[PDB]
């Protein structure tokens, strides 16, 4: 495989210094002058705390539509003028966008009486004042308030907050050029903002929404192998073998009446058809990066509920003990990471980390706080930042040791939790699970050893190592928020520049959750934690 520099007409070859947005071919993407995203392109600013630093693309308009499409100031132009009846929407679009009309005609919305839920009902009559319907539009009292409210019951890390918190206040997305993290906007906003999730537009078929694969489009990959774990496990094996056999899986049945041979994502997480997908969750553990013994007496009632779900096709004992095994795997995983972290932390404390945070490019905030610093556990001069303030947890713009630590807990550890939870034994072991963390521990130790050996040699020979320029600056690094803040707002951080209240300021844990924990801690006599 070569970087092919032939056949394609030369007239279209980009030469050094030429704009990257010219449309010319730059071999291996080299030598081009970075022009950045089109800031003249008609679009919407992102909502939320960090609106000012949120670089947006036109495409984003669809993804948080109430703010980014539906406001008069933002709504995009449309070449078709006039206000139309439903008949007219259908007739025109049946040819202009055939698939949409094909889908609509299949939908229950079209057949509804006395009046159908038509294109105009969801989009408006005036073609110059069209709107994109958010979850709020679907969730009106007259329509589907039930499902909206159900979903909205979710806490942090649920379908209720995956846009407003996770995405709108996403560090990396804000930090980087848009497009670097474009996929994050397209993935994160959907569950909260668009109800075409799971049951696709414009058919809105609950039968297709009941299929496991619906979840895979988001619940897969590097930091949550939810689909992969389920799919390859015996539940997923049973599923793939039987899913088109109507005698084994009847998707026409409502989830309350679901009598499948094996479970679906929906069978477990959307028990009874409840739209709060987090309803049965025990405790939020930051994607499984944070650790908890879910089998502990503290969570007895919550674990019991899970056993009630498995009860459908297993003895309580079998399920109880299998989930206990998961708990053990989770605990043993964090044992490994603690050892891994110690190696990394020691490099920082001994100041032999290559390089130290102060010699890296400033983080998204415009600070030189240690990547791995957790404000609740770490405090000191070496870590940086104010008391209680965390670092920008990342796999980018850091040392190999920092990166491998991130990968160990942020990727491999999650494969153990999700793997064991969904019955994928290999995901929890060989397939980048337990043995993934093992491999990375070795990698961290080796990197620590090398860095310490160099530091020792340089001391004795009397070299004071000057960290290289590429740790500080570079073509990509220069485009980040960090350097911009340091240069243009010298004394301040992004938090200073964005003083508005965040999601966490306005959204708290439900009263019943605090009430349960306090009751159980008193019942068992365990000390409460700190801020």
């Amino acid at each position: 495989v070569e970087i092919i520099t032939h056949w394609v007409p030369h007239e279209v070859y980009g030469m050094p210094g030429e704009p990257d947005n010219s449309g010319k071919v730059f071999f291996s993407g080299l030598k081009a002058k970075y022009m950045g995203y089109p800031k003249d392109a008609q679009r919407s600013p992102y909502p939320g705390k960090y609106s000012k630093f949120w670089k947006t693309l036109p495409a984003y308009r669809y993804y948080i539509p109430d703010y980014m499409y539906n406001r008069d100031e933002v709504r995009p132009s449309n070449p078709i003028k006039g206000t139309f009846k439903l008949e007219q929407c259908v007739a025109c679009h049946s040819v202009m966008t055939p698939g949409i009309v094909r889908d609509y005609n299949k939908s229950a919305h079209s057949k509804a009486e006395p009046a159908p839920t038509g294109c105009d009902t969801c989009h408006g009559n005036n073609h110059q004042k069209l709107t994109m319907p958010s979850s709020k539009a679907c969730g009106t009292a007259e329509c589907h308030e039930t499902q909206y409210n159900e979903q909205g019951q979710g806490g942090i890390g649920s379908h209720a907050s995956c846009s407003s918190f996770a995405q709108v206040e996403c560090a990396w997305s804000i930090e980087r050029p848009p497009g670097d993290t474009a996929g994050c906007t397209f993935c994160h906003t959907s569950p909260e903002e668009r109800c075409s999730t799971c049951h696709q537009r414009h058919q809105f078929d609950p039968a297709v929404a009941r299929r496991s694969e619906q979840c895979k489009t988001c619940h897969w990959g590097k930091d949550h192998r939810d689909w992969e774990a389920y799919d390859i496990g015996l539940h997923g094996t049973v599923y793939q073998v039987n899913k088109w056999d109507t005698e084994q899986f009847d998707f026409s049945k409502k989830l309350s009446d679901a009598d499948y041979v094996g479970p679906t994502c929906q069978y477990c997480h959307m028990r009874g058809g409840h739209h709060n997908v987090q309803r049965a969750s025990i405790v939020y553990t930051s994607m499984g990066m944070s650790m908890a013994d879910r089998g502990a007496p503290l969570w007895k009632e919550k674990r019991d509920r899970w056993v009630s779900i498995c009860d459908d096709c297993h003895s309580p004992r079998f399920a109880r003990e299998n989930l206990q095994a998961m708990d053990e795997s989770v605990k043993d995983a964090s044992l490994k990471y603690r050892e891994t972290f110690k190696v990394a932390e020691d490099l920082l404390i001994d100041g032999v980390l290559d390089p130290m945070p102060k010699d890296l490019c400033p983080d998204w905030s415009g600070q030189h706080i240690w990547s791995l610093k957790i404000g609740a556990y770490h405090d000191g001069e070496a870590y940086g930042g104010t008391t209680g303030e965390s670092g920008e947890f990342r796999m980018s713009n850091c040392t190999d040791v920092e990166r491998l630590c991130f990968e160990s807990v942020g990727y491999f550890q999650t494969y153990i939790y999700k793997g064991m939870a969904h019955g994928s034994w290999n995901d929890a072991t060989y397939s980048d699970g337990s043995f993934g963390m093992d491999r990375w521990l070795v990698n961290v130790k080796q990197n620590a050893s090398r860095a310490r050996r160099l530091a020792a040699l340089e001391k004795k020979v009397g070299i004071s190592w000057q960290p290289e320029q590429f740790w500080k600056t570079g073509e990509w690094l220069d485009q980040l928020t960090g350097p911009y803040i340091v240069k243009n707002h010298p004394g301040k951080t992004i938090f200073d520049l964005c003083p508005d209240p965040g999601w966490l300021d306005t959204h708290h844990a439900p009263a019943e959750e605090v009430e349960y924990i306090e009751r159980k801690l008193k019942e068992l006599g365990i000390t409460a934690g700190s801020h």
Binding site: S51, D72, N125, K136, Y148, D500
Partner: protein
């Protein structure tokens, strides 16, 4: 002959997030927003003044002319000052 009334959706936003408990006045009609931050009004043809008020002291105004059987979604952002804890 039945004059088909216009349907007006009004969504109250505070830089992205829905405003809960905001009062929307359209013509003579009043609606206090739920979790949606959205009120749906069924109105006879004519020109109306939409006003969104919230207990923080922030307001948004828009005048709208509705024809027979019109459907319009209106999205009004009241700024970051309209965002209140819990």
């Amino acid at each position: 002959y039945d004059v088909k009334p216009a349907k007006l959706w009004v969504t109250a936003i505070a830089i992205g997030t829905p405003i809960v408990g905001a009062e929307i006045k359209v013509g003579d009609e009043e609606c206090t927003t739920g979790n949606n931050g959205t009120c749906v009004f069924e109105l006879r043809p004519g020109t109306y003044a939409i006003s969104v008020h919230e207990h923080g002291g922030q307001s948004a105004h828009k005048e709208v002319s509705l024809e027979e059987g019109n459907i319009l979604f209106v999205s009004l952002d009241l700024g970051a000052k309209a965002r209140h804890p819990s």
